[PDB]
Amino acid sequence: SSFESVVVIDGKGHLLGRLASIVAKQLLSGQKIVVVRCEALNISGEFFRAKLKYHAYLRKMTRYNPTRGGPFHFRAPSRIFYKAVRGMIPHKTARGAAALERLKVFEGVPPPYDKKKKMVVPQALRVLRLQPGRKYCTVGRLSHEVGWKYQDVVARLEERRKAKGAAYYERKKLAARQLSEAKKAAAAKVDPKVSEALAAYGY
Amino acid sequence: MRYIHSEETIPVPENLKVSIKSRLVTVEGPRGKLQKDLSHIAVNFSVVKKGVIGLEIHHGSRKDVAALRTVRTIINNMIIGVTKGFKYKMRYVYAHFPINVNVEKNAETGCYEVEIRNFIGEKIVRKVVMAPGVEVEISKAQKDELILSGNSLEAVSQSAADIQQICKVRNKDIRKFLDGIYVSEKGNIVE
Amino acid sequence: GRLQEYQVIGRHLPTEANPNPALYRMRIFAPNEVVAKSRFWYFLRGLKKVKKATGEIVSVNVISEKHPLKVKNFGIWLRYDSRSGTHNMYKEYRETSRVAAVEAMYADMAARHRARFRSIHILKVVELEKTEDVKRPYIKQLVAKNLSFPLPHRVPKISTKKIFSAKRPSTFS
Amino acid sequence: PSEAGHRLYVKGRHLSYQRGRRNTHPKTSLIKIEGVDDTAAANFYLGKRVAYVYRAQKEVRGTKIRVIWGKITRPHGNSGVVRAKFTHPLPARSFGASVRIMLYPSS
Amino acid sequence: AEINVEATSWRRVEVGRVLKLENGSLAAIVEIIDHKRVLADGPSSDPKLATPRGIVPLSRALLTPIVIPKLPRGARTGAVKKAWEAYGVDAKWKETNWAKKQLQQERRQSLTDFDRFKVMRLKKQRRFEERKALAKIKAAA
Amino acid sequence: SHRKYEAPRHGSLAFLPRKRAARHRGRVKSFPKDDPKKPVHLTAAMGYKAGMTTIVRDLDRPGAKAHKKEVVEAVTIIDCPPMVVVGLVGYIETPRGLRSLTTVWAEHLSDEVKRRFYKNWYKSKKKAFTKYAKKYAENNGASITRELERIKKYCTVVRVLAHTQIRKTPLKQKKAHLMEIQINGGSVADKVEFGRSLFEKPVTIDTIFEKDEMIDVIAVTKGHGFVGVTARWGTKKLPRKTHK
RNA sequence: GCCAGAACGCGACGAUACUACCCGCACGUUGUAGACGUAUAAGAAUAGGCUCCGGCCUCGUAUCCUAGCAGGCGAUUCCUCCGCCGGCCUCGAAGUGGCCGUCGGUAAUUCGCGUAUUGCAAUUUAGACACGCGCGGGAUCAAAUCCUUUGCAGACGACUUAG
RNA sequence: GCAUCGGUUCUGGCGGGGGGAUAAAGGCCCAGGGAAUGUGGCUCCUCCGGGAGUGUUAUAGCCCUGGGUGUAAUACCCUCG
Ligand SMILES: [K+]
Ligand SMILES: [K+]
Ligand SMILES: [K+]
Ligand SMILES: [K+]
Ligand SMILES: [K+]
Ligand SMILES: [K+]
Ligand SMILES: [Mg+2]
Ligand SMILES: [Mg+2]
Ligand SMILES: [Mg+2]
Ligand SMILES: [Mg+2]
Ligand SMILES: [Mg+2]
Ligand SMILES: [Mg+2]
Ligand SMILES: [Mg+2]
């Protein structure tokens, strides 16, 4: 366990329901969470089964007036994830409302949260949970087929930010190569006995 | 009941080369290049000998093992096509109305197009676009014959099926009305 | 550590018309001796005209494996009840003791045939001395010559309380 | 000069009261201690003092900050959560707030 | 004919393979029971590296790169001990990176409060020389 | 139980909220999709409605019954004095939709447009764009050309601002109408060059449309007041002896 | 394509009197679901990868930073690390970072003076944003409603117009 | 707030005693008997890594039956501090 000011989670490769239950418990404890790349989440099973589930959801609506009270069906990948979290929280209480105020969800990686560290929740990773040979789908594909409009805008923006990262990674590799060279030249320079005392201590 | 070890082998002629990287197969030979992506199957490749490829599945179920022979045949056909090529033939069959076929080579896309006229005396005109890499030609050795050739068996076979499936008789007894274009011979360009 | 094999010897109560009655012996697998004796009277009631109220127990002893470090192949004969009718079976196992073989059998019958403990009779447990006495193909692959195999796609063991890893775990251990 | 901090306590969070599924008892609270993840680790902290500090509006005797004192009594569950008793039960709007775990009664 | 294959290459469970257990102990495989269990024992002189004879579940073990050559299947403790020492398993295990990592972890956990103060000061003196060298190479670009 | 006989429903649910329109001037909700291989051009205009009349012509439609014979048809007349271009706007693509980031005006604006920004023009001080105009006389208008360069670099949709010359019609109104008109054409650099060269110049309707072309018309319909079901939806009247 | 437009969803632009606005300084009469080192940017595969090309990978069990009256005053000594300003470039997904210059501070080594009495524990009153108040400097001189009027509108409000 | 006690209760660690096939195994030593998923040798096929025969310890080893160390150790159950 560790207390942080904020945790940023890279959503690619996580199972939708398992990540939702862990995130919900952190919020009720008093931890702030941010989830990015909500379009790359995963759902177990074939895609056709996920489509049939959403269609059953779409058929439910208030009979006497469809502008009030009725289940409002959001289409964006981040709003699909938000719905799963809200089901695991007492959102009709003042305590529950405050907990939801500690969460942000996005598609892609907006400029506040690039140039920042993204963590991973291994208890919900697909490559560690699903038996090889089973089938899975992506939330990004499901959203595109129920009326989400900005799949290609996000795809083009993500390509641009990865191109900037390639330049950043090039500089970062050069710095490490120089630091290693500096440690070699300085090691055999001066330290007559500090080297052995540190080695005995484990450093 | 899981099987501990299942294996298959593939020989390779000295005229070509094979590359595997992250379960992406590339076959290079005297007639062109072919690629195939097999990242949906959990298999292990290795170099058994100087010119033999190995395929293994460890601790596999009965359902999982069935796909081992399937992968072997697919890659083997890839080698055959790149070194010899494939060649399908089709034949026109009609009773009263002759079938007219016109073949043109498009310039912008580099593909072939086939037009069908006078099928059971219909005024509509049928058009089909062949897959890239597949070449069509009217036969000169005999009448009412089409010849399709290429490097990929998947491409040649699916294009030939497109032509056969477009010509159908509707609202009639098809045991009596037998008009259409049908595949009659499958072989290789060389030999 | 769930089951042990016992030896139970029992006898009809002696009477004036028959002093020194006959003695019967059975081998019983049970978690403790209280249910070992109860199981003994259950089987004897089905073979001879004796009850617990007209008999007595002579001796109870624990039988221990003679070499619990040698790998062996076992064969078991049994009789069980399905939802309609009773049937006979013969199964095989590979472990280092008779007690281990019986414990695996009870789990196997529950998984594959939904048979409970209350509907199974054990007939005979025999160690197969020759490698030619193996019949079932799922045992034959294990006694093959020069056996070896790798372990692909192994999930590393990670503490539950450590959420929020900072790196993508591998599966090549 | 002295680029260091001054911390002598361990951080904690107030989770909830002792409760069933539908009944709650405010006289005991559950506290999560940062870094402890089993019963063996939680045995170290039995008997220590816990402080809950917060702000008010007016000054009483030179400050606008108030404290409620308590102590740790026994572990809870299998994952390092512990139980505590305070002089007054905690305000229950602080489910999620932070507390200070001292080291005062030592060894 | 040119063949270029790039794939995985695992370590195999076999008679003679040396395993590492949860509590830093070692053992050698003498018999295979299933795809999940194995019979093993380690007859080592070092009390921290020795294990009794018994069955080990494979889910709680790691495969070291050490394999004893020509270990007979089902060999008893006396035969294993002779082959263990003739090959030099203890010396080979000490040269692996797994052993060195374990030793480093043990040293850092055995530090007292006075040791922690002194390791901070010793690192600063080495750090001073690092910054001077790094500035020189970076300035020359 | 089921209704005795079948009949379709009265009215359509697609035009469902039967409320007054939000704005008096019509609103263009979509523009024709752009093709960068065509020359730059405008896509809309505005005018005023005068009335209807009758014409006579001979039909050309082989196979029809009235082929090569005269027909009588009704037509509509729209009064269209030229428009004046005042500025342009740029738009960018976001994961939340299009949004505008800049708009740059021209140096001189007529009193026709300036009346649009007021509700009591007769007693105002009329200072609407007085400070903006000075940006053209400072540093050779570097601030003006800075915004133009921004549109060339980031935007992908360019529209123009234009207003009518209502003083050329017989109307009593003095306040003009203003709108945005998209530019479809070659390149984003070309769109800015074309749009800026039209600053405070008149544009005639014959340069936008032509003869034998199909177009669309957008406006707000004629207004009636509070109306009952019989005329509003078209339901059957009830018998003569119905009480209440 | 077509209709509505969240009356507690968002963007661009015009003019902004009343110290309503901008800058700097100093205070607290104040509020915040909860500072106390609130330190860590590659992408991708998982039946494969990283690299300084020598090799390396179960393991963040890591790396950085971390001493001095809550951190004083001098010396010996060192050319490291940190900050406020200014100048050039750069950044549009909800606009950010880099280079250079002046100035201020600074245990990598080793010392000299000071610390007491808060009396044997009692939050270590210490952060960041908002809001208010008082000075000292700059910039600015506007609109809306009623009222009269129109009929492209209308039960009354509202709407399209003119003064 | 601390120290020394009384009542109730939760939770760690250490020293002994008894039982069973006087645990069963196991290491070392003595004597007898066997075989194969046959070690070394010998023969044949391929040099292309190896494979196939033959037969009972040799240049590896394994399984049964008695005996000694031995009132061995350890596990499990019970029990005094
Ligand atoms: K009816
Ligand atoms: K000092
Ligand atoms: K006790
Ligand atoms: K004893
Ligand atoms: K013995
Ligand atoms: K031999
Ligand atoms: Mg018919
Ligand atoms: Mg009906
Ligand atoms: Mg009447
Ligand atoms: Mg609105
Ligand atoms: Mg007491
Ligand atoms: Mg003894
Ligand atoms: Mg003993």
GROMACS .gro file of N, CA and C in nm, chain B residues 108-186:
model
  237
  311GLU      N    1  -0.570   0.253  -6.340
  311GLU     CA    2  -0.548   0.324  -6.214
  311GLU      C    3  -0.512   0.227  -6.101
  312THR      N    4  -0.583   0.115  -6.091
  312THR     CA    5  -0.564   0.022  -5.981
  312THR      C    6  -0.481  -0.100  -6.019
  313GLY      N    7  -0.457  -0.123  -6.148
  313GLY     CA    8  -0.376  -0.236  -6.189
  313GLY      C    9  -0.442  -0.371  -6.173
  314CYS      N   10  -0.574  -0.375  -6.158
  314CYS     CA   11  -0.646  -0.500  -6.143
  314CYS      C   12  -0.713  -0.538  -6.275
  315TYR      N   13  -0.775  -0.656  -6.276
  315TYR     CA   14  -0.850  -0.704  -6.391
  315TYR      C   15  -0.999  -0.698  -6.362
  316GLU      N   16  -1.077  -0.677  -6.468
  316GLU     CA   17  -1.221  -0.671  -6.458
  316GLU      C   18  -1.283  -0.764  -6.561
  317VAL      N   19  -1.396  -0.824  -6.525
  317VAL     CA   20  -1.464  -0.920  -6.611
  317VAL      C   21  -1.610  -0.879  -6.622
  318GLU      N   22  -1.661  -0.875  -6.745
  318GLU     CA   23  -1.799  -0.837  -6.773
  318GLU      C   24  -1.872  -0.955  -6.835
  319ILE      N   25  -1.995  -0.979  -6.789
  319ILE     CA   26  -2.076  -1.092  -6.835
  319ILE      C   27  -2.202  -1.037  -6.901
  320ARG      N   28  -2.230  -1.084  -7.022
  320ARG     CA   29  -2.346  -1.038  -7.098
  320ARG      C   30  -2.425  -1.157  -7.151
  321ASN      N   31  -2.557  -1.136  -7.161
  321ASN     CA   32  -2.648  -1.231  -7.226
  321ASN      C   33  -2.653  -1.364  -7.151
  322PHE      N   34  -2.678  -1.356  -7.021
  322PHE     CA   35  -2.694  -1.475  -6.937
  322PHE      C   36  -2.843  -1.505  -6.927
  323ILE      N   37  -2.885  -1.615  -6.990
  323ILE     CA   38  -3.026  -1.650  -7.004
  323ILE      C   39  -3.099  -1.534  -7.072
  324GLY      N   40  -3.030  -1.465  -7.162
  324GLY     CA   41  -3.091  -1.355  -7.234
  324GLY      C   42  -3.136  -1.240  -7.147
  325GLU      N   43  -3.056  -1.204  -7.048
  325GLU     CA   44  -3.087  -1.091  -6.961
  325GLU      C   45  -3.018  -0.966  -7.011
  326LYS      N   46  -3.084  -0.852  -6.993
  326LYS     CA   47  -3.030  -0.725  -7.040
  326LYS      C   48  -2.931  -0.662  -6.943
  327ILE      N   49  -2.938  -0.697  -6.814
  327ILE     CA   50  -2.843  -0.646  -6.717
  327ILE      C   51  -2.703  -0.695  -6.751
  328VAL      N   52  -2.602  -0.618  -6.709
  328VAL     CA   53  -2.462  -0.651  -6.734
  328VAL      C   54  -2.393  -0.671  -6.600
  329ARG      N   55  -2.322  -0.783  -6.588
  329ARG     CA   56  -2.257  -0.822  -6.463
  329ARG      C   57  -2.108  -0.787  -6.468
  330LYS      N   58  -2.057  -0.735  -6.357
  330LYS     CA   59  -1.918  -0.693  -6.348
  330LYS      C   60  -1.856  -0.745  -6.219
  331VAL      N   61  -1.735  -0.799  -6.228
  331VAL     CA   62  -1.662  -0.849  -6.112
  331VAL      C   63  -1.518  -0.801  -6.121
  332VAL      N   64  -1.461  -0.764  -6.007
  332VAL     CA   65  -1.323  -0.717  -5.998
  332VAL      C   66  -1.239  -0.826  -5.933
  333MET      N   67  -1.132  -0.865  -6.001
  333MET     CA   68  -1.043  -0.967  -5.948
  333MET      C   69  -0.953  -0.908  -5.840
  334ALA      N   70  -0.902  -0.997  -5.755
  334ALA     CA   71  -0.811  -0.955  -5.650
  334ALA      C   72  -0.675  -0.919  -5.709
  335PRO      N   73  -0.602  -0.827  -5.647
  335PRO     CA   74  -0.469  -0.793  -5.697
  335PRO      C   75  -0.377  -0.914  -5.695
  336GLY      N   76  -0.294  -0.925  -5.799
  336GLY     CA   77  -0.206  -1.039  -5.816
  336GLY      C   78  -0.265  -1.154  -5.894
  337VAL      N   79  -0.393  -1.148  -5.930
  337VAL     CA   80  -0.459  -1.253  -6.006
  337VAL      C   81  -0.478  -1.204  -6.149
  338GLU      N   82  -0.439  -1.287  -6.245
  338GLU     CA   83  -0.444  -1.253  -6.387
  338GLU      C   84  -0.546  -1.341  -6.457
  339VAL      N   85  -0.627  -1.280  -6.544
  339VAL     CA   86  -0.731  -1.351  -6.618
  339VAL      C   87  -0.697  -1.347  -6.766
  340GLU      N   88  -0.749  -1.445  -6.840
  340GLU     CA   89  -0.718  -1.457  -6.981
  340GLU      C   90  -0.821  -1.548  -7.048
  341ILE      N   91  -0.864  -1.510  -7.168
  341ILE     CA   92  -0.949  -1.596  -7.249
  341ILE      C   93  -0.863  -1.703  -7.314
  342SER      N   94  -0.912  -1.826  -7.314
  342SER     CA   95  -0.835  -1.937  -7.366
  342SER      C   96  -0.834  -1.937  -7.519
  343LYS      N   97  -0.726  -1.989  -7.575
  343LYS     CA   98  -0.715  -2.010  -7.719
  343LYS      C   99  -0.703  -2.157  -7.756
  344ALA      N  100  -0.680  -2.246  -7.659
  344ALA     CA  101  -0.671  -2.388  -7.689
  344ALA      C  102  -0.808  -2.448  -7.715
  345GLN      N  103  -0.913  -2.394  -7.653
  345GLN     CA  104  -1.048  -2.441  -7.678
  345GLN      C  105  -1.146  -2.329  -7.645
  346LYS      N  106  -1.271  -2.350  -7.685
  346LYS     CA  107  -1.374  -2.248  -7.676
  346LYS      C  108  -1.442  -2.250  -7.539
  347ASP      N  109  -1.493  -2.133  -7.500
  347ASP     CA  110  -1.571  -2.117  -7.377
  347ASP      C  111  -1.490  -2.153  -7.253
  348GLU      N  112  -1.367  -2.103  -7.245
  348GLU     CA  113  -1.277  -2.136  -7.135
  348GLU      C  114  -1.211  -2.010  -7.080
  349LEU      N  115  -1.209  -1.999  -6.948
  349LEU     CA  116  -1.135  -1.896  -6.877
  349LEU      C  117  -1.019  -1.958  -6.801
  350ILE      N  118  -0.913  -1.881  -6.782
  350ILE     CA  119  -0.794  -1.928  -6.711
  350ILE      C  120  -0.751  -1.821  -6.612
  351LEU      N  121  -0.741  -1.858  -6.485
  351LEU     CA  122  -0.697  -1.769  -6.378
  351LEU      C  123  -0.569  -1.824  -6.317
  352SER      N  124  -0.470  -1.737  -6.298
  352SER     CA  125  -0.341  -1.778  -6.246
  352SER      C  126  -0.288  -1.673  -6.150
  353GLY      N  127  -0.198  -1.716  -6.062
  353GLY     CA  128  -0.139  -1.625  -5.965
  353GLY      C  129  -0.049  -1.699  -5.868
  354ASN      N  130  -0.002  -1.625  -5.768
  354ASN     CA  131   0.087  -1.679  -5.666
  354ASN      C  132   0.014  -1.729  -5.542
  355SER      N  133  -0.097  -1.667  -5.506
  355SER     CA  134  -0.169  -1.700  -5.384
  355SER      C  135  -0.287  -1.790  -5.418
  356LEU      N  136  -0.291  -1.909  -5.357
  356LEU     CA  137  -0.405  -1.998  -5.376
  356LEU      C  138  -0.532  -1.935  -5.320
  357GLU      N  139  -0.521  -1.862  -5.210
  357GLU     CA  140  -0.638  -1.796  -5.152
  357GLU      C  141  -0.694  -1.691  -5.247
  358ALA      N  142  -0.607  -1.616  -5.314
  358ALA     CA  143  -0.652  -1.512  -5.406
  358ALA      C  144  -0.715  -1.573  -5.531
  359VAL      N  145  -0.650  -1.673  -5.590
  359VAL     CA  146  -0.701  -1.733  -5.713
  359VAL      C  147  -0.834  -1.802  -5.689
  360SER      N  148  -0.845  -1.876  -5.578
  360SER     CA  149  -0.966  -1.952  -5.552
  360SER      C  150  -1.084  -1.862  -5.521
  361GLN      N  151  -1.062  -1.755  -5.444
  361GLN     CA  152  -1.173  -1.668  -5.408
  361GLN      C  153  -1.222  -1.587  -5.528
  362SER      N  154  -1.130  -1.547  -5.616
  362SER     CA  155  -1.170  -1.477  -5.738
  362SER      C  156  -1.250  -1.567  -5.830
  363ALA      N  157  -1.207  -1.693  -5.846
  363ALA     CA  158  -1.281  -1.786  -5.930
  363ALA      C  159  -1.421  -1.812  -5.875
  364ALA      N  160  -1.433  -1.817  -5.742
  364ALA     CA  161  -1.564  -1.838  -5.681
  364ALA      C  162  -1.654  -1.717  -5.698
  365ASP      N  163  -1.596  -1.597  -5.706
  365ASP     CA  164  -1.676  -1.477  -5.729
  365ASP      C  165  -1.748  -1.484  -5.863
  366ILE      N  166  -1.677  -1.529  -5.967
  366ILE     CA  167  -1.738  -1.541  -6.099
  366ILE      C  168  -1.848  -1.646  -6.098
  367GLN      N  169  -1.823  -1.760  -6.035
  367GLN     CA  170  -1.921  -1.869  -6.036
  367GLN      C  171  -2.048  -1.831  -5.962
  368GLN      N  172  -2.036  -1.757  -5.852
  368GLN     CA  173  -2.152  -1.728  -5.768
  368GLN      C  174  -2.237  -1.613  -5.820
  369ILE      N  175  -2.184  -1.532  -5.913
  369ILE     CA  176  -2.261  -1.418  -5.963
  369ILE      C  177  -2.366  -1.462  -6.065
  370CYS      N  178  -2.347  -1.576  -6.131
  370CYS     CA  179  -2.437  -1.623  -6.235
  370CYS      C  180  -2.529  -1.729  -6.177
  371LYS      N  181  -2.651  -1.690  -6.141
  371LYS     CA  182  -2.748  -1.782  -6.083
  371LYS      C  183  -2.882  -1.767  -6.152
  372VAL      N  184  -2.961  -1.873  -6.147
  372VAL     CA  185  -3.095  -1.876  -6.204
  372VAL      C  186  -3.195  -1.869  -6.089
  373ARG      N  187  -3.288  -1.775  -6.097
  373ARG     CA  188  -3.383  -1.749  -5.990
  373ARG      C  189  -3.524  -1.783  -6.035
  374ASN      N  190  -3.602  -1.841  -5.943
  374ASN     CA  191  -3.744  -1.872  -5.964
  374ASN      C  192  -3.764  -1.979  -6.071
  375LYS      N  193  -3.664  -2.065  -6.091
  375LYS     CA  194  -3.674  -2.174  -6.186
  375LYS      C  195  -3.628  -2.303  -6.120
  376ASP      N  196  -3.656  -2.415  -6.186
  376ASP     CA  197  -3.608  -2.545  -6.141
  376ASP      C  198  -3.463  -2.560  -6.187
  377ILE      N  199  -3.369  -2.555  -6.092
  377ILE     CA  200  -3.228  -2.558  -6.128
  377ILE      C  201  -3.178  -2.697  -6.164
  378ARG      N  202  -3.261  -2.801  -6.147
  378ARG     CA  203  -3.227  -2.931  -6.203
  378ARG      C  204  -3.248  -2.933  -6.354
  379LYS      N  205  -3.321  -2.836  -6.408
  379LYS     CA  206  -3.352  -2.826  -6.550
  379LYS      C  207  -3.273  -2.715  -6.619
  380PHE      N  208  -3.259  -2.600  -6.554
  380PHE     CA  209  -3.183  -2.487  -6.607
  380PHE      C  210  -3.044  -2.491  -6.545
  381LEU      N  211  -2.944  -2.533  -6.624
  381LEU     CA  212  -2.810  -2.559  -6.574
  381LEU      C  213  -2.708  -2.457  -6.621
  382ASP      N  214  -2.751  -2.337  -6.659
  382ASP     CA  215  -2.660  -2.239  -6.716
  382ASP      C  216  -2.575  -2.173  -6.609
  383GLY      N  217  -2.449  -2.148  -6.642
  383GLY     CA  218  -2.359  -2.080  -6.552
  383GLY      C  219  -2.215  -2.100  -6.596
  384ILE      N  220  -2.124  -2.053  -6.512
  384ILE     CA  221  -1.980  -2.071  -6.531
  384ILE      C  222  -1.927  -2.148  -6.411
  385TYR      N  223  -1.857  -2.258  -6.437
  385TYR     CA  224  -1.816  -2.351  -6.333
  385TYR      C  225  -1.667  -2.383  -6.344
  386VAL      N  226  -1.605  -2.409  -6.229
  386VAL     CA  227  -1.465  -2.449  -6.224
  386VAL      C  228  -1.454  -2.595  -6.264
  387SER      N  229  -1.354  -2.627  -6.346
  387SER     CA  230  -1.340  -2.762  -6.399
  387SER      C  231  -1.202  -2.824  -6.382
  388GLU      N  232  -1.099  -2.747  -6.348
  388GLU     CA  233  -0.964  -2.802  -6.340
  388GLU      C  234  -0.879  -2.714  -6.251
  389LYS      N  235  -0.804  -2.778  -6.160
  389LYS     CA  236  -0.715  -2.709  -6.068
  389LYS      C  237  -0.575  -2.767  -6.081
   0.00000   0.00000   0.00000
